[PDB]
PDB file of C-alpha atoms in Angstrom:
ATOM      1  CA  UNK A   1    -169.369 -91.353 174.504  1.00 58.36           C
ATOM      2  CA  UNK A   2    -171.666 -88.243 173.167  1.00 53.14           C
ATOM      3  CA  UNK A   3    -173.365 -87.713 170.647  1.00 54.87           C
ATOM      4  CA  UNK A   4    -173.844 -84.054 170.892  1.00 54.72           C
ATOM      5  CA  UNK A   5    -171.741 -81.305 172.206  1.00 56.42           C
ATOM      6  CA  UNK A   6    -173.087 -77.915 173.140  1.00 57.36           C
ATOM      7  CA  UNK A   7    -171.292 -74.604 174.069  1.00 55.24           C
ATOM      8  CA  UNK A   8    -171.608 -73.870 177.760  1.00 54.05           C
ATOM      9  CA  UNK A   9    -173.847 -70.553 178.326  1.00 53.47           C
ATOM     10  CA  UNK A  10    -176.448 -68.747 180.563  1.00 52.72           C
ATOM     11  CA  UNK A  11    -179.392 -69.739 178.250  1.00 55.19           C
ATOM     12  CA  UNK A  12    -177.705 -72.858 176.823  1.00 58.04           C
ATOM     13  CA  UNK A  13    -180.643 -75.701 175.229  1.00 58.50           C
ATOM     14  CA  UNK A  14    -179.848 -78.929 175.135  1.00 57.90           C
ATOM     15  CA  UNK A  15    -181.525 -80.131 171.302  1.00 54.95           C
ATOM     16  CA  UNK A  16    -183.528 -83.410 172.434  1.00 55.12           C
ATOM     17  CA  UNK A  17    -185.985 -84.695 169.668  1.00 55.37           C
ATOM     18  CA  UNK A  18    -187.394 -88.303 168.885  1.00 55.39           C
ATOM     19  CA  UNK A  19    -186.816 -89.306 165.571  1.00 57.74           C
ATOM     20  CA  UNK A  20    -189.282 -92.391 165.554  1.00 54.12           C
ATOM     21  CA  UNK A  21    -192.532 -93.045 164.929  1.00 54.22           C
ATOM     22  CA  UNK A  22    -193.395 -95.151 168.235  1.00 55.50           C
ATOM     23  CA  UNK A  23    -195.689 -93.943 170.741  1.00 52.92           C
ATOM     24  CA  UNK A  24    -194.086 -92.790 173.573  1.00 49.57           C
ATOM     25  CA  UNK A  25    -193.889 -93.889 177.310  1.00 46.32           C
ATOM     26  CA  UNK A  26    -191.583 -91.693 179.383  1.00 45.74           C
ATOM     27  CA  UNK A  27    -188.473 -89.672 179.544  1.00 43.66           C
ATOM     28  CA  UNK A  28    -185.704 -88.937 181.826  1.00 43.50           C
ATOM     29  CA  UNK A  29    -183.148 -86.740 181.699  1.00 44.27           C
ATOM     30  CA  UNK A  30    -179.788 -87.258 183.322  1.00 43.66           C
ATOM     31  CA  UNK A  31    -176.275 -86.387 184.357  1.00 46.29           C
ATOM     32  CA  UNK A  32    -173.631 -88.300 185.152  1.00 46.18           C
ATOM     33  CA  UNK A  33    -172.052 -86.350 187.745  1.00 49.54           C
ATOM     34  CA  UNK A  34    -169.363 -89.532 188.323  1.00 48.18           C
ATOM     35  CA  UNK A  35    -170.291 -93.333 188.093  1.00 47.40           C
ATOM     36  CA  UNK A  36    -173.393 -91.634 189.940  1.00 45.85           C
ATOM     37  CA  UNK A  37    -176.123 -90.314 187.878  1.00 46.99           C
ATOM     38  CA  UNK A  38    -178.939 -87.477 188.440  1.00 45.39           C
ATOM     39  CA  UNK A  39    -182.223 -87.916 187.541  1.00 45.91           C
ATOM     40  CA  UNK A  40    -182.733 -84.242 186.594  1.00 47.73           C
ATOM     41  CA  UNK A  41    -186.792 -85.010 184.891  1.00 48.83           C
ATOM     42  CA  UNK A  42    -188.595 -87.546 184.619  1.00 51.07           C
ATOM     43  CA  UNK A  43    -191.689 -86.755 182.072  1.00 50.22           C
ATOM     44  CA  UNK A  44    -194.476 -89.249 181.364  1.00 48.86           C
ATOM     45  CA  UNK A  45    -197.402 -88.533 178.806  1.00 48.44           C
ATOM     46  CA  UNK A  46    -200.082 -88.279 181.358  1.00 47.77           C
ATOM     47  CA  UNK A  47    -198.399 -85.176 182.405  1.00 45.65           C
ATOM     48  CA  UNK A  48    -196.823 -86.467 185.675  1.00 49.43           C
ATOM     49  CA  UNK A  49    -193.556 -84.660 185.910  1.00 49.02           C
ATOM     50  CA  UNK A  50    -190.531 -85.347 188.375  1.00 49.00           C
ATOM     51  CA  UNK A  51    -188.107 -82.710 188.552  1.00 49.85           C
ATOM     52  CA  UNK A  52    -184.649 -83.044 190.885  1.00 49.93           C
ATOM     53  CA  UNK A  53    -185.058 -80.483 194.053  1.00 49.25           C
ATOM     54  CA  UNK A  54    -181.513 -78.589 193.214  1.00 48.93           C
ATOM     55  CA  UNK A  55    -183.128 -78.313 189.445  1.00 46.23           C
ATOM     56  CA  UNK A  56    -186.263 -76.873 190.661  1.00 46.28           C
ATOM     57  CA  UNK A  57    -186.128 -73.141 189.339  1.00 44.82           C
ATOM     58  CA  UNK A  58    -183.365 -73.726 187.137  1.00 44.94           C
ATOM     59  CA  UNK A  59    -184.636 -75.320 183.829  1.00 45.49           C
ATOM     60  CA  UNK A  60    -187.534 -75.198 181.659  1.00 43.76           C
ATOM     61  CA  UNK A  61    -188.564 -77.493 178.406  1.00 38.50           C
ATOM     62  CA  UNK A  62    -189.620 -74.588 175.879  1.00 37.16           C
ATOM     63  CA  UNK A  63    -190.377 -77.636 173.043  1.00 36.46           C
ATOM     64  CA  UNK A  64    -191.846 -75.245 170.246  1.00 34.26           C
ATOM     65  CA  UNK A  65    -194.864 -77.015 169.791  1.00 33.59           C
ATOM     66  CA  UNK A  66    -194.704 -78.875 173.057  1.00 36.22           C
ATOM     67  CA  UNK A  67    -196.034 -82.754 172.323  1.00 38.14           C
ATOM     68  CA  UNK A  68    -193.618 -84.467 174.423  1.00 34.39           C
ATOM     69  CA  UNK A  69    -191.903 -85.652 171.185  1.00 32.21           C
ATOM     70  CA  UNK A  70    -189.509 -82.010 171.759  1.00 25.92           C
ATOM     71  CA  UNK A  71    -188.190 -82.505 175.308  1.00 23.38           C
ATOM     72  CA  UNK A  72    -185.079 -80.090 174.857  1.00 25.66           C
ATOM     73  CA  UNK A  73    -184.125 -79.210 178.076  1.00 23.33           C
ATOM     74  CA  UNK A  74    -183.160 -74.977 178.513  1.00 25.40           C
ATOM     75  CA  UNK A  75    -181.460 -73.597 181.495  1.00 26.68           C
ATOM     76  CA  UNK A  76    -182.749 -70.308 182.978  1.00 21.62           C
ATOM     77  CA  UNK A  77    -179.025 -69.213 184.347  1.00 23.15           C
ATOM     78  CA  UNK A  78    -176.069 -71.970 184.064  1.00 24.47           C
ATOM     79  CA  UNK A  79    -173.058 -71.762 185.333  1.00 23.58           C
ATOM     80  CA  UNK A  80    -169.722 -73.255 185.293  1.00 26.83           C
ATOM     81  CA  UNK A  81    -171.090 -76.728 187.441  1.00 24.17           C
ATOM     82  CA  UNK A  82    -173.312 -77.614 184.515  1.00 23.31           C
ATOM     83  CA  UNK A  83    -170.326 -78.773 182.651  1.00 22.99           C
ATOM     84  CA  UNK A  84    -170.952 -82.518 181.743  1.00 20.79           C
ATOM     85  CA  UNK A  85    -172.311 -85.208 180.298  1.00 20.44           C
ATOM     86  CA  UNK A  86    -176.651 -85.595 179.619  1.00 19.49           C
ATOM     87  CA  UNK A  87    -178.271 -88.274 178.492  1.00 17.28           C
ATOM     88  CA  UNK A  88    -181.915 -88.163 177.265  1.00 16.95           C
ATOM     89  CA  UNK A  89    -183.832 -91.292 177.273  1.00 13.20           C
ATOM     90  CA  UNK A  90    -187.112 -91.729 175.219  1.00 15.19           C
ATOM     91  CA  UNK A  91    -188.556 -94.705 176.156  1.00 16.10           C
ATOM     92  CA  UNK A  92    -191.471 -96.287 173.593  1.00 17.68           C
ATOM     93  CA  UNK A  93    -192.398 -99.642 175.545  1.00 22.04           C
ATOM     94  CA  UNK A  94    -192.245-102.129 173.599  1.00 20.01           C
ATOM     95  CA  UNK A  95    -190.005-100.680 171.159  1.00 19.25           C
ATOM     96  CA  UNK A  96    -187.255-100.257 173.239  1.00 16.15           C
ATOM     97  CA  UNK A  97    -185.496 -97.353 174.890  1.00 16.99           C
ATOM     98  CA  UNK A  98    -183.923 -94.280 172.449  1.00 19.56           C
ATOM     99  CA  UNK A  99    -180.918 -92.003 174.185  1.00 21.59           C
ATOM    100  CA  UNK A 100    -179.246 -89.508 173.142  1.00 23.28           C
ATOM    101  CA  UNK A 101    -176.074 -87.944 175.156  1.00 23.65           C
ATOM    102  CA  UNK A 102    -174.912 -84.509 175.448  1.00 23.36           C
ATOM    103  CA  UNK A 103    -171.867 -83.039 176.533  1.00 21.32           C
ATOM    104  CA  UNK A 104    -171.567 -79.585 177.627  1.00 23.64           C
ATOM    105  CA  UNK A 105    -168.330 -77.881 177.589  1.00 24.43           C
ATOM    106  CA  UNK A 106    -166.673 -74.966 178.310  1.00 24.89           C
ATOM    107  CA  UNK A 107    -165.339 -73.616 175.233  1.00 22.56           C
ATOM    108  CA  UNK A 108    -165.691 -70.463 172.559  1.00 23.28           C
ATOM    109  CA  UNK A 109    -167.553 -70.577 169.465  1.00 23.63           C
ATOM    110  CA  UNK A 110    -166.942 -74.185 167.473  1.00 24.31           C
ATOM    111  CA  UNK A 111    -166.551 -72.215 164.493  1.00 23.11           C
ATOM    112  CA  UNK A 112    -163.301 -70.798 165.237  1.00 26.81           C
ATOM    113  CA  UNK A 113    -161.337 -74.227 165.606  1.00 26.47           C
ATOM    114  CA  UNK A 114    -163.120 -75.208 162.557  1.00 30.53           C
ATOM    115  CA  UNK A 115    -161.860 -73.030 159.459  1.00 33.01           C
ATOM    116  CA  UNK A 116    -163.076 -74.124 156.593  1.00 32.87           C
ATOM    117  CA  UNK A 117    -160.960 -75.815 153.619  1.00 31.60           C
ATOM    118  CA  UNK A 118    -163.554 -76.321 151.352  1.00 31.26           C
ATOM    119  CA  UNK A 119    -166.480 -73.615 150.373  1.00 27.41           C
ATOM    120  CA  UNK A 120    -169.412 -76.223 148.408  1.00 27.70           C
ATOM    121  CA  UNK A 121    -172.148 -74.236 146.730  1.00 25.48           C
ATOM    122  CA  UNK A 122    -175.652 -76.035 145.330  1.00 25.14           C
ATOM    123  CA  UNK A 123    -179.304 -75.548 144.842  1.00 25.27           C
ATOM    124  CA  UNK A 124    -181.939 -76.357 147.160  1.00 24.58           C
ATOM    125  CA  UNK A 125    -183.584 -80.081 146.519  1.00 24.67           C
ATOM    126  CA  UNK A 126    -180.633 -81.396 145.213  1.00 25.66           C
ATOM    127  CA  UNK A 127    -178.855 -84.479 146.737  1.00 22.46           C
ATOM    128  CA  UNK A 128    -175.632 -83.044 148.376  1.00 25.18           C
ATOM    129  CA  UNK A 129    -172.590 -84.874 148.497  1.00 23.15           C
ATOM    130  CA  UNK A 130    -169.686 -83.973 151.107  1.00 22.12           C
ATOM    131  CA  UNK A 131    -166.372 -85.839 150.321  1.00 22.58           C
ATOM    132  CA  UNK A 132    -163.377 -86.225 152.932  1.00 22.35           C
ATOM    133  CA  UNK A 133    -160.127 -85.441 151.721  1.00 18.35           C
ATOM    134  CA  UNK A 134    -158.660 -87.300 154.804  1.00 18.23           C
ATOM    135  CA  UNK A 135    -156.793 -90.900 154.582  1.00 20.69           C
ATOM    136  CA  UNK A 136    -159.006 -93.356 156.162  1.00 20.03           C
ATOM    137  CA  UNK A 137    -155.696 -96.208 156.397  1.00 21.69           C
ATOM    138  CA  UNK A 138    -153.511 -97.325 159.754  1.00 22.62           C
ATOM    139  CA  UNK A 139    -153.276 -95.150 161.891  1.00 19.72           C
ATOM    140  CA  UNK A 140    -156.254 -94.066 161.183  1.00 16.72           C
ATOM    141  CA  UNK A 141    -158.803 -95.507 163.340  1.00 15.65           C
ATOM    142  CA  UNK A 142    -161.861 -94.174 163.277  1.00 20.12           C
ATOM    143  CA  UNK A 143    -163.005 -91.261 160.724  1.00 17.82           C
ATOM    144  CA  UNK A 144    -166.350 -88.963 162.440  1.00 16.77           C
ATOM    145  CA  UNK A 145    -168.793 -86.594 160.112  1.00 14.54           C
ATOM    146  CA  UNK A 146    -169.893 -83.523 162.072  1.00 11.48           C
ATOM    147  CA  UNK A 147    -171.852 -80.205 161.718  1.00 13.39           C
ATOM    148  CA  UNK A 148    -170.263 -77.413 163.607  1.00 14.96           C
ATOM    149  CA  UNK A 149    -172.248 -74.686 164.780  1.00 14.88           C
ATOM    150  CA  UNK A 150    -170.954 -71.820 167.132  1.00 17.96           C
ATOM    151  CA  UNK A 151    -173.328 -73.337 169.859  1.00 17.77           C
ATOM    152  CA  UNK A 152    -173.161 -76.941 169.381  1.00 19.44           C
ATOM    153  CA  UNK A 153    -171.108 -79.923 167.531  1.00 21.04           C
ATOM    154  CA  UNK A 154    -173.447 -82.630 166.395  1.00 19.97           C
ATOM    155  CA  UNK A 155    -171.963 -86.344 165.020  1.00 19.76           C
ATOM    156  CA  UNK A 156    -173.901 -86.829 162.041  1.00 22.38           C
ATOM    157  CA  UNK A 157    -172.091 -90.400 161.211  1.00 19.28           C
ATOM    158  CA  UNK A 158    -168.491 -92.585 162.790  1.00 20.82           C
ATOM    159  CA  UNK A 159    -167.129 -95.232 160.688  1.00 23.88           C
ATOM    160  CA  UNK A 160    -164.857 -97.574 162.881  1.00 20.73           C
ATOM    161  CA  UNK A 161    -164.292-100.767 160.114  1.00 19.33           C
ATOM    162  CA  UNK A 162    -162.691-102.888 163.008  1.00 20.19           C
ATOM    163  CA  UNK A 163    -165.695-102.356 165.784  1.00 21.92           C
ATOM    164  CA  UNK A 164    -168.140-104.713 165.280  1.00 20.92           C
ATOM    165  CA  UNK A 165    -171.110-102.762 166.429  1.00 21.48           C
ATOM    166  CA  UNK A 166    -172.144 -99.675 164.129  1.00 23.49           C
ATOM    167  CA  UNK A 167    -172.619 -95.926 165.684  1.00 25.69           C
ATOM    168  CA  UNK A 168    -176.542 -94.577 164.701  1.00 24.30           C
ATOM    169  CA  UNK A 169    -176.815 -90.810 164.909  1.00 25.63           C
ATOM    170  CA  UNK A 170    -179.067 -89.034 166.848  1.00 25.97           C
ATOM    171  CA  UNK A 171    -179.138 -86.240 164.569  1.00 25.59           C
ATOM    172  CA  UNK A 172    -182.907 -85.069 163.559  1.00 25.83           C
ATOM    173  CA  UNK A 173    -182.427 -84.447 160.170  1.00 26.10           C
ATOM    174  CA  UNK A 174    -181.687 -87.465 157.802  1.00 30.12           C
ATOM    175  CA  UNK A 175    -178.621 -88.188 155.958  1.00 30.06           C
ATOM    176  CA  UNK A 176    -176.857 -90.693 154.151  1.00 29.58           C
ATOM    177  CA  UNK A 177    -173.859 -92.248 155.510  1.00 28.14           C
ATOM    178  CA  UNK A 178    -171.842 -95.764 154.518  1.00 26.97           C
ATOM    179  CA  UNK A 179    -168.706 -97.423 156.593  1.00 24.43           C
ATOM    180  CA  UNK A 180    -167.832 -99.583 153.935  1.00 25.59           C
ATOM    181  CA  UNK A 181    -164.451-102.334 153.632  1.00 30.08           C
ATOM    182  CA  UNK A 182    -163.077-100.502 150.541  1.00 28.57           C
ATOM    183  CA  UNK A 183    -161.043 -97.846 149.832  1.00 30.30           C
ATOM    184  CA  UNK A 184    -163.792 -95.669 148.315  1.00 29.93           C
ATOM    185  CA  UNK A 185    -164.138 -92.087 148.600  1.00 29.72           C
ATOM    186  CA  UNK A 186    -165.142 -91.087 152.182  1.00 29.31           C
ATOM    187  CA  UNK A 187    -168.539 -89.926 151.523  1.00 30.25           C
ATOM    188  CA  UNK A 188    -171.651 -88.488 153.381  1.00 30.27           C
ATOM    189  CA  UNK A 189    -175.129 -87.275 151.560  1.00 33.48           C
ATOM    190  CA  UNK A 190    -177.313 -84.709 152.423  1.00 30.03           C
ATOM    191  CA  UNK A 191    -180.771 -86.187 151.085  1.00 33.07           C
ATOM    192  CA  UNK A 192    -182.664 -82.770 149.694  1.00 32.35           C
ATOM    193  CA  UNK A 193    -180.435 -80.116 150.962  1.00 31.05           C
ATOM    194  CA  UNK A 194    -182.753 -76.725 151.944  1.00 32.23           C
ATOM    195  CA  UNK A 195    -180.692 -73.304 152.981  1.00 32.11           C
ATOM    196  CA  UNK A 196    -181.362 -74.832 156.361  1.00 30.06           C
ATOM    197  CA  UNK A 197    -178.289 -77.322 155.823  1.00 26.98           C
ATOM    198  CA  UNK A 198    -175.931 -74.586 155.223  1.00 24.95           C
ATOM    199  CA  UNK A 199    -173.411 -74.578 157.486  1.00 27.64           C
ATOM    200  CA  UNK A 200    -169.849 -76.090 158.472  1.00 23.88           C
ATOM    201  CA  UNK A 201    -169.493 -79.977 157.955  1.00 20.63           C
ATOM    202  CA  UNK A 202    -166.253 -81.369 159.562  1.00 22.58           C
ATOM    203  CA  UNK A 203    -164.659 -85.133 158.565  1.00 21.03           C
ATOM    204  CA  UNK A 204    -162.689 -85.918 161.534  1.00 23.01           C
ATOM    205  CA  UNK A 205    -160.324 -89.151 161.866  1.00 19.22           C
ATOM    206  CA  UNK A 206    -158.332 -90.339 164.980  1.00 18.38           C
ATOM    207  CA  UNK A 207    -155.960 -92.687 164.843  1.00 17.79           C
ATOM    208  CA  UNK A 208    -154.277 -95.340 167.545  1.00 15.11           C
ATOM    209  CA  UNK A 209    -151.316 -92.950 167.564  1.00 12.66           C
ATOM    210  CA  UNK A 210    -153.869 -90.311 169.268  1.00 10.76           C
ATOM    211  CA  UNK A 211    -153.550 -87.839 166.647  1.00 10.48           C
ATOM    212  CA  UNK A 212    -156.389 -85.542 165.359  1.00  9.97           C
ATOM    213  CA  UNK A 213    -156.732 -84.089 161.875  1.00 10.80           C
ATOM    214  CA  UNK A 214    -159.897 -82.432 160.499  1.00 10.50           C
ATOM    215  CA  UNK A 215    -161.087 -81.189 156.960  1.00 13.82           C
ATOM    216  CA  UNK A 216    -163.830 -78.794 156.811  1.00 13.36           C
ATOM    217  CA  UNK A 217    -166.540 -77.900 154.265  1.00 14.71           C
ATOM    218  CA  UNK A 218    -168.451 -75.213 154.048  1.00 15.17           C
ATOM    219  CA  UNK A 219    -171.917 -75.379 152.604  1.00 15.47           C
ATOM    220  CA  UNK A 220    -173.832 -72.800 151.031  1.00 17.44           C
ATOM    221  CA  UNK A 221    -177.353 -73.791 149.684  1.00 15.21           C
ATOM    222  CA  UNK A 222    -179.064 -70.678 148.699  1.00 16.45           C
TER     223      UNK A 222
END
């Protein structure tokens, strides 16, 4: 139901970036308020831009290099009533529509519900690999590879062997994930790791029984 979650602050950014190669047509950005949704933006590449009348002065789209490909949206001064769910939709006619959904809670730094069990040192360009020491069997239903940040939580892969549709994260930077049948070793790859992948990566699992457990690694890449 997200695919993102950011902590809730003044200046808070909410990270927004096409990973394709199409040519884009539009985007919107939304929140669903209920069922309802607001149309916060609306950006096409000819530079027509619709922006919601209570969103007027309140957020910008800093997009270092601004090509339309960034369309992060920043808030000027949030508050408490910006708590939510966002969804960012690229569309890149014919190619289809690409969204990405953000949740913004209230909550302190990620970091400190997230101590590590793990510290994993290598050397930049090397092909990382993170291993879960979680059970993947009944209850377990699901099992969820995220990097935690103090600012924001992003799903880098979710393996769910009974749903029949696969989840495709909306992370920017590539890596290599597998929701295999057999009872290998829960794996994700970082693809040439730079000191810019250092960080916390959590393996999360939930179960039918509604029970959370968590394993965290952190990753130093000097």
């Amino acid at each position: 139901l997200w695919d993102t979650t950011v902590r809730l602050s003044e200046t808070m950014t909410l990270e927004c970036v096409y990973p394709l190669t199409h040519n884009l047509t539009q985007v919107e950005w939304t929140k669903n308020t209920g069922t309802k949704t607001v149309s916060i933006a609306v950006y096409n590449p000819n530079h027509n831009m619709h922006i919601e009348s209570n969103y007027l002065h309140r957020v910008h789209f800093l997009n270092s290099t601004v090509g339309f490909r960034n369309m992060s949206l920043s808030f000027y001064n949030a508050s408490e009533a910006d708590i939510g769910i966002y969804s960012c939709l690229f569309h890149a006619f014919p190619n289809g529509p690409w969204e990405k959904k953000i949740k913004v809670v209230w909550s302190d730094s990620f970091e400190i519900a997230a101590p590590s069990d793990s510290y994993l040192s290598a050397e930049p360009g090397q092909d990382v690999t993170l291993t879960c020491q979680l059970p993947r069997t009944w209850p377990v239903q699901q099992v969820i590879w995220e990097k935690v940040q103090p600012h924001q939580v992003d799903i880098l892969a979710s393996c769910n062997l009974s749903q029949e549709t696969r989840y495709t994260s909306k992370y920017l930077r590539q890596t290599r994930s597998n929701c295999s049948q057999g009872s290998m070793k829960s794996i994700l790859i970082i693809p040439n790791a730079m000191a810019a992948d250092s960080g916390l990566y959590r393996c999360r699992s939930e179960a039918i029984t509604g029970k959370n457990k968590s394993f965290v690694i952190r990753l130093i890449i000097t």
